[PDB]
From a paper:
Apical localization of the Crumbs (Crb) transmembrane protein requires a PDZ-mediated interaction with Pals1 (protein-associated with Lin7, Stardust, MPP5), a member of the p55 family of membrane-associated guanylate kinases (MAGUKs). Pals1 belongs to the MPP family of proteins (membrane protein, palmitoylated), also known as the p55 subfamily of membrane-associated guanylate kinases (MAGUKs). Pals1 acts as a scaffold protein, recruiting other proteins to the apical domain of the cells: the L27 domains of Pals1 bind to Patj and Lin7, while the amino-terminal regions of Pals1 can interact with the PDZ domain of Par6, linking the Crb and Par complexes.
To define the molecular interaction between human Pals1PDZ and Crb17, we successfully crystallized the complex and determined its structure at 1.23 Å resolution. A single Pals1PDZ–Crb17 complex is present within the asymmetric unit. The Pals1PDZ adopts a canonical PDZ fold consisting of two β-sheets flanked by two α-helices. The total buried surface area between Pals1PDZ and Crb17 is ∼500 Å2. Leu321 of Pals1 adopts a strained side-chain rotamer on binding the ligand, allowing the side chain of Ile1406 from Crb17 to point into a deep hydrophobic pocket in Pals1PDZ. Van der Waals contacts between Crb17 Leu1405 and Pals1 Pro266 stabilize a closed carboxylate-binding loop enveloping the peptide ligand. Charged interactions with the ERLI motif are also found; Crb17 Glu1403 forms a salt bridge with Pals1PDZ Arg282 and also forms hydrogen bonds to the side chains of Thr270 and Ser281. In contrast, in the presence of the Crb17 peptide Phe318 swings out of the pocket to pack against the Arg1404 side chain of Crb17. Overall, the structure explains the tight conservation of each side chain of the Crb ERLI motif through selective interactions with the Pals1PDZ domain, consistent with the binding affinities measured in solution by fluorescence polarization. Our structure of a Crb17 peptide ligand bound to the Pals1 PDZ domain explains the basis for this conservation and presents detailed charged side-chain interactions, carboxylate-binding loop contacts and hydrophobic pockets for the penultimate two Crb residues.
Author numbering:
A (entry chain A): 246 to 335
B (entry chain B): 1393 to 1406
The structure:
Amino acid sequence: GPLGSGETVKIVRIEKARDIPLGATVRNEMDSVIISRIVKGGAAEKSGLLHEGDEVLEINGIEIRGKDVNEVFDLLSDMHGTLTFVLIPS
Amino acid sequence: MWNLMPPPAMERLI
Ligand SMILES: CC(C)CC(C)(C)CC(C)(C)CC(C)(C)C
Ligand SMILES: [Cl-]
Ligand SMILES: [Cl-]
Ligand SMILES: [Cl-]
Ligand SMILES: [Cl-]
Ligand SMILES: [Cl-]
Ligand SMILES: [Cl-]
Ligand SMILES: [Cl-]
Ligand code: NA
């Protein structure tokens, strides 16, 4: 710091229902995918484990870094069950 | 100001 991506990752498990969004939004900062806002009452809020500024590296073994958020949107819409996120916390 | 500022990043729901 300030250079380089640091010495920590955070792994979180969150339950997603079929065909219902987890209730978090994402944006790109270039290749990266960053949690932006949280839906009130949704699975992400209830978990307390996803926050603004968290960078999503991987979900369930899928490399998320480098994807446009339009691609991430489509991928997550096809997922359910326990999702394991690998994050760089804000 | 309305012209030098960077535009908002696109946001998508997951
Ligand atoms: C956890 C299990 C009881 C549910 C299932 C994964 C086998 C089925 C599902 C209904 C939740 C999956 C799907 C929505 C894709 C049809
Ligand atoms: Cl850097
Ligand atoms: Cl660090
Ligand atoms: Cl942590
Ligand atoms: Cl389900
Ligand atoms: Cl469902
Ligand atoms: Cl849900
Ligand atoms: Cl969206
Ligand atoms: Na789907």
